[PDB]
Amino acid sequence: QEQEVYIVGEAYSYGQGWVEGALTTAESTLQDFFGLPRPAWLPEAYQLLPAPAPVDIDNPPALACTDCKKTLTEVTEFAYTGI
Amino acid sequence: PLDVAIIGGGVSGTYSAWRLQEAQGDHQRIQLFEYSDRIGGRLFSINLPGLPNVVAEVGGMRWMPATKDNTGGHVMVDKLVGELKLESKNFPMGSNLPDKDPVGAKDNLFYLRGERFRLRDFTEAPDKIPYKLAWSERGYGPEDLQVKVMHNIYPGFDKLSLAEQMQVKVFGKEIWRYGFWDLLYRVLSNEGYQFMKDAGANVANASAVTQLPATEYSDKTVFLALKKGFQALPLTLAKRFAEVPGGLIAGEQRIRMNRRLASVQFSDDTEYPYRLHFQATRTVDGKTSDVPGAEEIIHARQVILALPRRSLELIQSPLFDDPWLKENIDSVLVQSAFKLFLAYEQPWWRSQGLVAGRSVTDLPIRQCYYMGTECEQDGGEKTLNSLLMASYNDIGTVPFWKGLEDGAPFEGYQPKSLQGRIDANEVVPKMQYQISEEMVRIAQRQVTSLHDQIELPAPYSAVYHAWDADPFGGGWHEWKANYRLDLIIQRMRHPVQEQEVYIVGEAYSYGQGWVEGALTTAESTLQDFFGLPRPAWLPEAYQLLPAPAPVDIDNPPALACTDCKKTLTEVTEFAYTGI
Amino acid sequence: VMVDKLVGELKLESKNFPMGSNLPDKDPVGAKDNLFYLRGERFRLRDFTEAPDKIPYKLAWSERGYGPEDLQVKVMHNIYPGFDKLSLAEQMQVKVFGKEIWRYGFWDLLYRVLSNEGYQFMKDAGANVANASAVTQLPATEYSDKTVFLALKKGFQALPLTLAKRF
Amino acid sequence: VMVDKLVGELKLESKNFPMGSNLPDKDPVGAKDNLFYLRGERFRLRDFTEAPDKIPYKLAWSERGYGPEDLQVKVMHNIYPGFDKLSLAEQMQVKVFGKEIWRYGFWDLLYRVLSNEGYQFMKDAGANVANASAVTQLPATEYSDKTVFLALKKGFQALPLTLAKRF
Ligand SMILES: Cc1cc2nc3c(=O)[nH]c(=O)nc-3n(C[C@H](O)[C@H](O)[C@H](O)COP(=O)(O)OP(=O)(O)OC[C@H]3O[C@@H](n4cnc5c(N)ncnc54)[C@H](O)[C@@H]3O)c2cc1C
Hints:
It is classed as oxidoreductase. With 83 residues, chain A is mainly alpha-helical. Chain A contains two helices and no strands.
């Protein structure tokens, strides 16, 4: 936090093994510690890096299932694919 | 000072009280006595922690809707449930997906003799079935095989009235004189019988007349359940019996829980000839024990014993010395039933292609039902918490599970959904039979084997119930061979002509194993010996109890075949189904 | 998205990166005829579903009839249904067999749910790393040769060169 | 010992109780040709070892090649080697899977060590009771049609009758 060295690239991205990983880390670091706006060509809808879980996830609050009917349907129909 | 004492807070008891109170309550003292602190008898519904909208039906769980013409299906249940404004839901026996051509039960599992196959393989891949069936028994599922067997014995047998079925002779003997297994031994290979038992419904020493009738299998067959659990039906009735306005006895005094009818004695009094001796009981954690002390004594004109066979046997009365009643109380077998529920945090089976209905195995667990996810229910919490039920009734498997009752209780674990809601030590409910850890480990291993998995998620909660001890003796009854069950059905409602004691309930009905049996016996007895009209909600088209055959059916007149062309066509086309 | 739009921005020409056949133009074979040679046996991709008896792995009865990718999808739904559709924050909180998923290595977690022959099959016919976090290896999608990929006509190195050139 | 010596004492005549054939007098067939008819299949006792492919139970690879009795011996040695040779007092102190053996029923203990098809095989081709104490059901001996049994020529009821007669 003290120093003004930044690390970008695929290595410590979410999109490892992709050029997308490298670009997303670079763009986020630029928007966050260099103050550059988001490019015109870059949509706002796109999340560059995944939001983290809380630092303390030991005994976390429950995950409320959003549209479980659709998830369970997808899962069962996938199973039917094999059968 | 009681005009009617009703013994038993099951569905037949509670229905009887409600009817009599709503009809004659203004001038008749009616009281309902129940052995335990719980109303419902063999209807018994619970919600496990984390599953507030997925009911675990430890007793009865579904009924067949009334037909359009109101002549078939469980008409009494369907219309009574309509009358009391209880909400019903579909009881699925398979998958609705894909919404275009629903798989139904076709993908549900079988694991028999070390082989795995799915239901669709009985017709699609009969080489997978590991039973050495006769050439003529291949290509049917177990149910369809039973239909074929029945048409072999007598074509269209299921479509005959009980009176005609009691006159049908096979291999020179009337069918009601055979036990199911003995009759099948004559027409079906040993491997066939083994196949029907294992992949299968039936009892081997029960009357062939009530076991043989079978229908063509169809996962499209519709069943209904109550959203609040089947126990809502008797509870509602009890609730509506103690809330009838008016009457000699005040609403809150009409139901007397925790009273075990110890005995019925005959008093010299002409007005109130029955002296009922009740023992007070207390119920702790679902277990009822006698409270030591005096017997409460009550006087009644009429008595309705809304009680199964074992319960009748535990009541002392000179009434039971009647030769007919002494002979015909033991005219029914009692089938023990056992249920195991396991609650999981996700429906691991949905990823295997399983949605509803049962998978079947020859492992001791026998059958597993997939019973529903909390989040997929109407107004259900946003939780993947799911319920699995296992059930067995077969005598041979019972000893296995019986040995696993001892040991440390299963404690479960507080699932994430319940964190900061329930206590960790309340995750596994306190029940009459407290599931042990060993039983849960072994059930989980057998469930894992059945689904062909290495390891499944562990259950966070469980419930075991046995319908075997007193007073129930078992889960349901079946007519024994060599008994004129058509005559016993009519007489047992009022067993001793002199006395004013009536017997109602599922035990000595035609519809044994169903709430419909209990309701039909109760309603007939009420219409016949209490004079109540038929309810408005109850159609006239529906026959409550089958008309009996003549007492002398030795050398009976011939049965004139009504539209034999249609029967023979049905029978032949059914045969084509297998071929 | 970043690559796609940045490539758009710098006016680099892209092309389809085919993963199979477009012929016959009516019903393209795709990757269905591409070869496998495993354990001395030859079969084609279509045989994972059309002819599963040709697959020379002694798979569990419940793991047959899937290609390697689809088998991984099935495994993931077995562990947690819809896991791939959760956010990273939710995936980091998912516990399996009493431990958070990000505390398992891929191979250790699979060992618990999939037969050894299953794992061997997914490795050989398969993407994955055995000691990598299960949270980033487990997410899988249904296989489809219709999945579209793009390449640069001048090669992917044209993207950094262009950038350097424009810097 | 008590029966044998008491029968000696009362001068009741005993005879061999054969469990198989004595012919041919050179190499007696014994029980090797006696029949089994299980699950629609026919085989003879000798086929448990001579032709195990004829046995129509899907036994584990490690349970094949034994007759039912020998399979029970194998199971018992798996649980505790030499268990049958221990005194009752020692057998009541033997713990398996963290519980004393006399706290298990036979079927529950076998469920842990033997496949379901194994149990089914031992019941069908087999002696045992499924809910009885494992301590008194588990002890088994190697099968041998050469095992000798005796009967009374006048029937076993001659023993109590004689006693009553001599009382
Ligand atoms: C496992 C299982 C599953 C079932 N599933 C279905 C199903 O899916 N569909 C269906 O339609 N039916 C089902 N049934 C059957 C249905 O539950 C019964 O047929 C019906 O509930 C019985 O009603 P009843 O009034 O005859 O008797 P019971 O329910 O037995 O009621 C008798 C009552 O009398 C009480 N009693 C006993 N002795 C005394 C005494 N001395 N004094 C006072 N009270 C006493 C008992 O405690 C009990 O409350 C099932 C049953 C079981 C066991």
